[PDB]
């Protein structure tokens, strides 16, 4: 019954400004004997399957660019895109793998 939250819903950017988004959990997602922080950040472009950007809340997957530096631990988590461009207008979902997995709400980046 782990329920994830995300804020804000409609985050509007301009092409180049650093932006964040929070994924505040309800229960602690911290493995107590290996300190892993079970989480995963997914990006879904409009009309495509999702992609895996971050897993274990910090370890960026290969092929994902170096502008997706997400971190945070324990219950609150953030994802920081360094310099956004027109090739990042997509939703962003956070998952948790502690209990039975539950995706977050979803924040989308609307270019101005």
């Amino acid at each position: 019954d782990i329920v994830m939250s995300q804020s804000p819903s409609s985050l509007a950017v301009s092409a180049g400004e650093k932006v964040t988004m929070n994924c505040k959990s309800s229960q602690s997602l911290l493995n107590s004997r290996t300190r892993k922080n079970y989480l995963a950040w997914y990006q879904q472009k409009p009309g495509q399957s999702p992609k895996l950007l971050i897993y274990w809340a910090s370890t960026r997957e290969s092929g994902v660019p170096d502008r997706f530096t997400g971190s945070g631990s324990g219950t609150d988590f953030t994802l920081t895109i360094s310099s956004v461009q027109a090739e990042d207008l997509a939703f962003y979902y956070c998952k948790q793998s502690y209990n039975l997995p539950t995706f977050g709400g979803g924040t989308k980046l609307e270019i101005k």
Partner: peptide, 28 residues
């Protein structure tokens, strides 16, 4: 991920009373 040996009383009390036993996991 973790093997532990229970040698005496100070190691047994440090297993049961801490946050080692976590049953809200799914695969542990």
């Amino acid at each position: 991920e973790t093997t532990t040996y229970i040698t005496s009383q100070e190691v047994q009390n440090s297993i049961l009373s801490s946050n080692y036993f976590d049953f809200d996991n799914l695969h542990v």
